[PDB]
Amino acid sequence: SVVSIPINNAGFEDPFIEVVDDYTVDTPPGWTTYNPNNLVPEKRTTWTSNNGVGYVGPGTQFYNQLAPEGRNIGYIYLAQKPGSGVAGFEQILDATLEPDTKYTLKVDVGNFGGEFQKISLAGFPGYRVELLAGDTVLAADHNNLYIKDGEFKTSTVTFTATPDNPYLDQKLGIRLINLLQGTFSGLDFDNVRLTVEPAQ
Ligand SMILES: [Ca+2]
Ligand SMILES: [Ca+2]
Secondary structure, eight states, X not given: OOEEOOOTXXXXXXXXXXXXXXXXXXXXXXXXXXXXXXXXXXXXXXXSSEEEEEEOOTTOSSOSSOOSSSSEEEEEEOOSOTTSOOEEEEEEEXXXXXXXXXXXXXXXXXXXXXXXXXXXXXXXXXXXXXXXXXXXXXEEEESOSOOOTTEXXXXXXXXXXXXTOTTTTSEEEEEEEEOOOSSSOEEEEEEEEEEXXXXX
């Protein structure tokens, strides 16, 4: 009795990207830009703070593996100096928080390596993965995994809602966040999964 909750564009596969290591600079379809510190501008180009989708296939300089799922990942790049704030992706789901239910949110987090226009991509800004109900962060993984340049690791966030939880019936949400706590200050995400089961 482990059931999946649908997520739009959960693997960042829309839009299709043809060319090796190519990318978009606009918010991926199905997601919004989480921008609590106004770090990401409305109009983006390659070198502004931005987010978007990128193809990770044979030929890539970014990883010693391919995209965890499908062809593409979703990425967030922040140009401001470390400490300036955070930004990322948010998606509000149609599912609502239900009692006596354990939620498991999994997402693959990527620390790409390489060099872009003579700028080293070594280093990592840190990540946070959040599960929301309404405006409330129910549970989050703030940067617990060590992710070396060129690899992905799976973050797992869990939350159990009891019958007295104040946020029952509010819409579930997911945030994938660049913490901007190091350089090179970009990171990737892929393969967002949310499942439910009865509480322990
Ligand atoms: Ca994917
Ligand atoms: Ca890196």
